[PDB]
Scaffold this motif. Structure first.
Motif, PDB file in Angstrom:
ATOM      1  N   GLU A 393       0.799  -1.222   0.000  1.00 39.96           N
ATOM      2  CA  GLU A 393       0.000   0.000   0.000  1.00 39.96           C
ATOM      3  C   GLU A 393       0.834   1.276   0.000  1.00 39.96           C
ATOM      4  OE1 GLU A 393      -3.124   0.544  -0.379  1.00 39.96           O
ATOM      5  OE2 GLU A 393      -4.180  -1.292   0.126  1.00 39.96           O
ATOM      6  N   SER A 414      -5.205 -11.963  -5.379  1.00 40.24           N
ATOM      7  CA  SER A 414      -6.324 -11.190  -5.921  1.00 40.24           C
ATOM      8  C   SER A 414      -6.492  -9.859  -5.179  1.00 40.24           C
ATOM      9  CB  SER A 414      -7.631 -11.991  -5.845  1.00 40.24           C
ATOM     10  OG  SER A 414      -8.132 -12.050  -4.517  1.00 40.24           O
ATOM     11  N   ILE A 417      -2.985  -7.567  -6.395  1.00 38.34           N
ATOM     12  CA  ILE A 417      -2.963  -6.986  -7.734  1.00 38.34           C
ATOM     13  C   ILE A 417      -3.510  -5.557  -7.823  1.00 38.34           C
ATOM     14  CG2 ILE A 417      -3.935  -7.147 -10.062  1.00 38.34           C
ATOM     15  CD1 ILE A 417      -3.582 -10.199  -9.854  1.00 38.34           C
ATOM     16  N   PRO A 418      -4.690  -5.294  -7.242  1.00 40.63           N
ATOM     17  CA  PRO A 418      -5.258  -3.941  -7.295  1.00 40.63           C
ATOM     18  C   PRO A 418      -4.318  -2.891  -6.702  1.00 40.63           C
ATOM     19  CG  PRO A 418      -6.951  -5.500  -6.720  1.00 40.63           C
ATOM     20  CD  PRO A 418      -5.629  -6.233  -6.604  1.00 40.63           C
ATOM     21  N   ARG A 419      -3.528  -3.284  -5.716  1.00 41.67           N
ATOM     22  CA  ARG A 419      -2.609  -2.332  -5.116  1.00 41.67           C
ATOM     23  C   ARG A 419      -1.386  -2.163  -6.016  1.00 41.67           C
ATOM     24  NH1 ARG A 419      -5.928  -4.020  -0.527  1.00 41.67           N
ATOM     25  NH2 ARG A 419      -4.768  -3.675   1.425  1.00 41.67           N
ATOM     26  N   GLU A 421      -1.402  -2.513  -9.244  1.00 43.76           N
ATOM     27  CA  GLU A 421      -1.864  -1.815 -10.445  1.00 43.76           C
ATOM     28  C   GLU A 421      -1.654  -0.313 -10.274  1.00 43.76           C
ATOM     29  OE1 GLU A 421      -5.962  -2.847 -10.532  1.00 43.76           O
ATOM     30  OE2 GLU A 421      -5.787  -4.129 -12.302  1.00 43.76           O
ATOM     31  N   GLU A 422      -1.812   0.143  -9.040  1.00 44.01           N
ATOM     32  CA  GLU A 422      -1.686   1.550  -8.703  1.00 44.01           C
ATOM     33  C   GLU A 422      -0.260   2.086  -8.614  1.00 44.01           C
ATOM     34  OE1 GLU A 422      -4.023   2.031  -5.163  1.00 44.01           O
ATOM     35  OE2 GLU A 422      -5.789   1.162  -6.126  1.00 44.01           O
ATOM     36  N   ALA A 424       2.643   0.353 -10.352  1.00 50.21           N
ATOM     37  CA  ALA A 424       3.527  -0.100 -11.415  1.00 50.21           C
ATOM     38  C   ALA A 424       2.893  -0.028 -12.804  1.00 50.21           C
ATOM     39  CB  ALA A 424       3.999  -1.529 -11.124  1.00 50.21           C
ATOM     40  N   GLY A 425       3.745   0.120 -13.815  1.00 50.78           N
ATOM     41  CA  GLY A 425       3.274   0.187 -15.188  1.00 50.78           C
ATOM     42  C   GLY A 425       3.059  -1.193 -15.787  1.00 50.78           C
ATOM     43  N   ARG A 426       3.788  -2.185 -15.274  1.00 47.23           N
ATOM     44  CA  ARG A 426       3.680  -3.555 -15.774  1.00 47.23           C
ATOM     45  C   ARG A 426       3.756  -4.602 -14.659  1.00 47.23           C
ATOM     46  NH1 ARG A 426       7.783  -7.072 -17.923  1.00 47.23           N
ATOM     47  NH2 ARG A 426       9.266  -5.325 -18.003  1.00 47.23           N
ATOM     48  N   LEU A 427       2.769  -5.497 -14.623  1.00 42.69           N
ATOM     49  CA  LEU A 427       2.726  -6.559 -13.616  1.00 42.69           C
ATOM     50  C   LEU A 427       3.183  -7.878 -14.244  1.00 42.69           C
ATOM     51  CD1 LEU A 427      -0.695  -5.796 -11.876  1.00 42.69           C
ATOM     52  CD2 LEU A 427       1.570  -4.827 -11.472  1.00 42.69           C
ATOM     53  N   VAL A 428       4.109  -8.567 -13.585  1.00 43.97           N
ATOM     54  CA  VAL A 428       4.627  -9.838 -14.095  1.00 43.97           C
ATOM     55  C   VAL A 428       4.253 -10.980 -13.140  1.00 43.97           C
ATOM     56  CG1 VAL A 428       6.690 -11.075 -14.859  1.00 43.97           C
ATOM     57  CG2 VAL A 428       6.552  -8.602 -15.129  1.00 43.97           C
ATOM     58  N   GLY A 446       5.154   4.210 -15.773  1.00 44.97           N
ATOM     59  CA  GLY A 446       4.308   4.080 -14.600  1.00 44.97           C
ATOM     60  C   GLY A 446       4.323   5.307 -13.701  1.00 44.97           C
ATOM     61  N   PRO A 447       3.705   5.217 -12.514  1.00 54.32           N
ATOM     62  CA  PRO A 447       3.650   6.323 -11.554  1.00 54.32           C
ATOM     63  C   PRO A 447       5.056   6.819 -11.181  1.00 54.32           C
ATOM     64  CG  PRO A 447       2.023   4.673 -11.005  1.00 54.32           C
ATOM     65  CD  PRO A 447       2.942   4.050 -12.029  1.00 54.32           C
ATOM     66  N   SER A 454       2.942   9.110 -16.149  1.00 58.57           N
ATOM     67  CA  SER A 454       2.375   7.764 -16.027  1.00 58.57           C
ATOM     68  C   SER A 454       1.407   7.342 -17.128  1.00 58.57           C
ATOM     69  CB  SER A 454       1.686   7.607 -14.666  1.00 58.57           C
ATOM     70  OG  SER A 454       0.599   8.506 -14.539  1.00 58.57           O
TER      71      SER A 454
ATOM     72  N   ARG B  40     -10.228   3.003  -5.164  1.00 61.44           N
ATOM     73  CA  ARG B  40     -10.080   1.656  -5.703  1.00 61.44           C
ATOM     74  C   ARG B  40     -11.422   1.000  -6.020  1.00 61.44           C
ATOM     75  NH1 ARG B  40      -6.313  -1.559  -2.053  1.00 61.44           N
ATOM     76  NH2 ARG B  40      -4.860  -0.024  -2.954  1.00 61.44           N
ATOM     77  N   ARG B  43     -13.235   2.660  -9.173  1.00 64.94           N
ATOM     78  CA  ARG B  43     -12.769   2.300 -10.509  1.00 64.94           C
ATOM     79  C   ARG B  43     -13.054   0.838 -10.859  1.00 64.94           C
ATOM     80  NH1 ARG B  43      -7.573   1.572  -8.279  1.00 64.94           N
ATOM     81  NH2 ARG B  43      -6.676  -0.488  -8.761  1.00 64.94           N
ATOM     82  N   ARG B 471      -4.574   5.924 -17.011  1.00 72.58           N
ATOM     83  CA  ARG B 471      -3.196   5.532 -17.278  1.00 72.58           C
ATOM     84  C   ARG B 471      -3.197   4.042 -17.551  1.00 72.58           C
ATOM     85  NH1 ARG B 471      -1.581   2.985 -12.479  1.00 72.58           N
ATOM     86  NH2 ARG B 471       0.361   2.408 -13.561  1.00 72.58           N
ATOM     87  N   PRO B 472      -2.332   3.587 -18.468  1.00 73.14           N
ATOM     88  CA  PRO B 472      -2.260   2.166 -18.812  1.00 73.14           C
ATOM     89  C   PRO B 472      -1.444   1.298 -17.863  1.00 73.14           C
ATOM     90  CG  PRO B 472      -0.684   3.316 -20.109  1.00 73.14           C
ATOM     91  CD  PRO B 472      -1.472   4.388 -19.360  1.00 73.14           C
ATOM     92  N   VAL B 473      -1.822   0.027 -17.819  1.00 72.06           N
ATOM     93  CA  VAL B 473      -1.147  -0.971 -17.004  1.00 72.06           C
ATOM     94  C   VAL B 473      -1.031  -2.196 -17.895  1.00 72.06           C
ATOM     95  CG1 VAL B 473      -1.311  -2.504 -15.000  1.00 72.06           C
ATOM     96  CG2 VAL B 473      -2.111  -0.136 -14.832  1.00 72.06           C
ATOM     97  N   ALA B 474       0.151  -2.801 -17.940  1.00 79.40           N
ATOM     98  CA  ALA B 474       0.349  -4.006 -18.744  1.00 79.40           C
ATOM     99  C   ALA B 474       0.346  -5.205 -17.806  1.00 79.40           C
ATOM    100  CB  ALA B 474       1.673  -3.932 -19.494  1.00 79.40           C
ATOM    101  N   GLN B 476       1.402  -9.144 -17.622  1.00 81.92           N
ATOM    102  CA  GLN B 476       2.187 -10.170 -18.290  1.00 81.92           C
ATOM    103  C   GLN B 476       2.124 -11.569 -17.659  1.00 81.92           C
ATOM    104  OE1 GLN B 476       6.069  -8.845 -19.719  1.00 81.92           O
ATOM    105  NE2 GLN B 476       6.989 -10.749 -18.962  1.00 81.92           N
ATOM    106  N   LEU B 482      -7.071 -14.200 -12.634  1.00 79.10           N
ATOM    107  CA  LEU B 482      -6.528 -13.012 -11.966  1.00 79.10           C
ATOM    108  C   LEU B 482      -6.545 -11.751 -12.831  1.00 79.10           C
ATOM    109  CD1 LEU B 482      -3.398 -14.514 -10.130  1.00 79.10           C
ATOM    110  CD2 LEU B 482      -5.713 -14.152  -9.255  1.00 79.10           C
TER     111      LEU B 482
END
Ligand SMILES: NC(=O)c1ccc[n+]([C@@H]2O[C@H](COP(=O)([O-])OP(=O)(O)OC[C@H]3O[C@@H](n4cnc5c(N)ncnc54)[C@H](OP(=O)(O)O)[C@@H]3O)[C@@H](O)[C@H]2O)c1
Ligand SMILES: NC(=O)c1ccc[n+]([C@@H]2O[C@H](COP(=O)([O-])OP(=O)(O)OC[C@H]3O[C@@H](n4cnc5c(N)ncnc54)[C@H](OP(=O)(O)O)[C@@H]3O)[C@@H](O)[C@H]2O)c1
Lengths: 502, 504
Positions: A393, A414, A417-419, A421-422, A424-428, A446-447, A454, B40, B43, B471-474, B476, B482
């Motif tokens: 957070e 689950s 992820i929502p946190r 998303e706020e 980072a620009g890319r989640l792996v 990203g932020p 961003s 949160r 959205r 703003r975009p989010v990728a 991967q 999920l």
């Protein structure tokens, strides 16, 4: 005045002197770029697309020279450099496809209705056009793909913007060869040389003047938070503020659940490989790993620690980067509540390092969230999942965020992820953040501080939109409308009408 | 609160009934903190739900239309006929974004098809979508108390994007904003959604707006107003530890180029010009502030006709004492300059007179201070030596919301040289018409190069306005379960998605 590049392996000057440009050359370059801006954005899509492909071919033709020079200037392996030239060339070709397709126009049409009461609905059509000359600052860690002919330059030329590159002092010879390639491409395409200009110099006044020049309409930057933020501020203090797209840094937080540890016995091995890739000189390097206080974690740590001790000495891009790394790791390793493991190395080489601490001390030391560029990383042992989610957070902006887990953890993932998303620009998922696919769906940014904007990406097909702005055309006759917006759609591009899908 | 303030009767200058609170940094923090707390969930609501909220707000607004109109009329002096039309514009604007959200187009779903057998390294499964930036601060416009204010375009598009909204109520119409806020409060109750989704703050102490723009939980700003205040707030937004997007429309003079054949073709062109520049007493951001024309007999006749109409204009009552004083002070100053002629209508303060200035391109070049906008029923005509002179002038124009051209096929050769020049300085080009009207549709671009906007790559009006708050989010290699619905393999939402570059 002139300056020389530094041999990354010896610290001694390499042959070939480079000029030290000043505000004089900036003014000259920017003025010429502005002079050709209109014609450049007005070229047929096929022509600008051809230019990009020609640049790609010219670069490949000098691959030998580029690799040989880049290797001595940066100490990056010839095989890594050979792969980067290919990435650079295919990146240019991607944007060639984008421009050729005419998708970047983002054509939108409102169907008129002259018999509407009280007032009639006018014929309105809009498209994206180039902002104008763009200034680009290349990355030191990716001398090819993120520099002179890198993603920022490629996407800007694609958008129809002339480009002025402030050559990185870490690899002037590499940039020069690349500039010679672009010069050749422009000659073959019979287009103005002012479309692309490379400026060189080790005096910071150069970059500042470029960012502040009134003819410069946007900036692309890849580098440190300190210099990046300084230049960003300059860009927004101008009489006419301009967009500044800078990737300043990130720690790329990674969350590893116990089951993931149980599922992959070599997870620690993978971690060390990721954090030491390119000697840790990746902006996407996993800089912090959050894990639970279980036996799996304790074993993970011991395996990683053993590999780190075994790790070979690293030669960083420049003596300067070598110095910041050494002082910061030795400095942090002396901080409160942190354990560190070093590999064996003697200057000018640096040792890889693995720090270990508890979530309690992590909360107590916000400075540990700042990136330390080099082959080092930190593991934060958490009390439980709630502790882990709590920590996510407060995370600062990052290029990426990674999660290693199995189905057993999905309930908690689950919620995580929502946190992520706020921030980072890319989640792996169940993989490592290091690699950056140059495709259509990428989001490299990203932020803040991951990026100063961003709502954009510096890598991927969408990167072209950073250099474009929309214009609406109301009630113009067919003959005066740009081809992209003509009623018959002579270019056969995708267009969105009254909200329908393009 | 420690202090309260009252709205000013636009017609008398005296205070109107009903006191409003003077909020400070304390209420800002409370509001921003509460907004962050629900960001949160807001959205992640189903598109259909957020779409419903927008439509419910529109209905609630319409239900209080009589109260809104009655109050707005006294606070702003705008004709009720104008206010009735603006409420409809406001309501239909909200419904437009309801359609946008419902369609799921704003997600801008993009997918890269994976290729696990690619050598040397495999191609990963990558999918991206747009998500809300977070709480958004909105400063409404004084000249459009409804469509560009509390429930205006910025608020509507931000809620659509999934961002909570905090509005710093304009001191020019606090009563109007309050009623509108009550409507949104009702809509949220009916939809059974958190009140923190929308908050209206009031106050005449500037410290309020500055604290709001600088609050760490605020992630973007929407602003419509003066360049002085707008630029100051923009600078604050970019000095923050974490800079945030600031979308402000600061001003423009909307240059208009009229060719001789156009004047011949339309005998009432001067009449149309005067109607456009005096619409709403000239209090339109899109008002044609400068007209460039050639030194021909048609132009002289045009000028004389316009001058005659100006002399007969009915006295105008502007929005606020400050806008009034600013107008009067600025038109008198400019008129005193050498090389410029001015024609005034008859009026006695507090009412203001309409004005038409006339000058040459030479004197225009000698007085750069003339490009500065003067908010009110005033405009300037610049007589040019020839078309080349006209083109030379367009090359040095500042950013503007619009640029207009009046011509006939005869002029197309010159008009084609002019358009490229105007494309570079304006967000919207108008041909053989006037810039004042702004169609709320899908193709609109309301904004443009500085100072028209602080972010030329956007629009504050039209369906595309929603993208300013996203703003975009990728994602991967995430498993289907999920991934957000918009990016699931099966496309359960049935939205438009772009795969491997294909057309969405
Ligand atoms: N997150 C990202 O995407 C990412 C990836 C790659 C690079 N970077 C970061 O860059 C760092 C490596 O050091 P670097 O040498 O590449 O960074 P840097 O010191 O910020 O230099 C980048 C460029 O900006 C110029 N510059 C820096 N500050 C400036 C200012 N205030 N005035 C004028 N010019 C200025 C430099 O000029 P000189 O040539 O005179 O130094 C160079 O051309 C690492 O932290 C790395 O992570 C960010
Ligand atoms: N380009 C377009 O799209 C567009 C559309 C319509 C309106 N506008 C422009 O709006 C202007 C009308 O003038 P105005 O008096 O309404 O504008 P303004 O003085 O800029 O005020 C607009 C809002 O910003 C606040 N504000 C301004 N200075 C501030 C500061 N430095 N610190 C904190 N709050 C600040 C004001 O607070 P107070 O309430 O305390 O004053 C008000 O709520 C015209 O120039 C018109 O062209 C532009």
């Amino acid at each position: 005045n002139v300056f020389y590049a530094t041999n990354a392996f010896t610290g001694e000057a390499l042959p070939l002197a480079f000029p030290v440009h000043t505000e004089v050359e900036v003014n000259q370059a920017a003025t010429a770029a502005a002079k050709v801006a209109r014609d450049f954005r007005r070229l047929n899509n096929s022509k600008r697309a051809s230019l990009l492909r020609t640049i790609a071919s010219e670069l490949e033709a000098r691959s030998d020279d580029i690799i040989a020079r880049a290797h001595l200037e940066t100490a990056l392996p010839e095989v890594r450099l050979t792969g980067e030239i290919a990435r650079t060339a295919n990146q240019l070709r991607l944007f060639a496809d984008v421009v050729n397709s005419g998708s970047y126009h983002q054509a939108i049409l409102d169907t008129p209705n002259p018999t509407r009461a009280p007032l009639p609905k006018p014929d309105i059509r809009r498209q994206q056009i180039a902002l104008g000359p763009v200034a680009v600052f290349g990355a030191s860690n990716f001398p090819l793909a993120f520099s002179a002919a890198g993603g920022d330059t490629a996407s800007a030329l694609a958008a129809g913007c002339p480009v002025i590159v402030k050559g990185h002092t870490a690899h002037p010879g590499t940039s020069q060869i690349v500039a010679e390639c672009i010069e050749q491409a422009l000659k073959q395409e019979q287009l103005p040389q002012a479309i692309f200009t490379l400026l060189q110099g080790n005096q910071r006044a150069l970059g500042q003047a470029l960012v502040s020049h009134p003819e410069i309409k946007a900036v692309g930057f890849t580098g440190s938070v300190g210099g990046g933020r300084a230049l960003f501020n300059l860009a927004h203090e101008r009489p006419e503020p301009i967009p500044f797209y800078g990737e300043l840094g990130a720690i790329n937080p990674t969350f590893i659940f116990p089951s993931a540890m149980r599922a992959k016995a070599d997870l620690a091995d993978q971690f060390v490989a990721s954090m030491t890739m390119g000697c840790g000189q990746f902006c996407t390097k996993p800089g912090v790993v959050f894990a639970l206080n279980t036996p799996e974690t304790q074993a993970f740590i011991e395996t990683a620690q053993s590999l780190i001790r075994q790790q070979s000495p690293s030669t960083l891009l420049t003596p300067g980067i070598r110095d910041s790394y050494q002082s910061q790791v030795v400095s942090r390793g002396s901080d409160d509540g942190i354990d560190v493991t070093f590999s064996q190395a003697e200057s000018p080489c640096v040792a890889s390092a693995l720090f270990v601490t508890s979530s309690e001390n992590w909360r107590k030391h916000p400075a540990w969230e700042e990136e330390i560029f080099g082959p080092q990383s930190l593991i934060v042992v958490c009390e439980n999942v709630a502790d882990m989610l709590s920590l996510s957070e407060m995370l600062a902006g990052s290029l990426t965020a990674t999660i290693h887990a199995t189905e057993e953890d999905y309930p908690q993932v689950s919620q995580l992820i929502p946190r992520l998303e706020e921030i980072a620009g890319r989640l792996v998922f169940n993989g490592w953040p290091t690699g950056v696919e140059v495709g259509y769906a990428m989001v490299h940014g990203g932020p803040y501080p991951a990026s100063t904007h961003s709502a954009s990406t510096s890598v991927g097909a969408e990167a072209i939109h950073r250099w474009l702005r929309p214009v609406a055309y109301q009630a113009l006759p067919e003959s005066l409308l740009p081809d992209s917006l003509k009623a018959e759609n002579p270019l056969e591009i995708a267009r969105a009408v009254d909200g329908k899908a393009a």
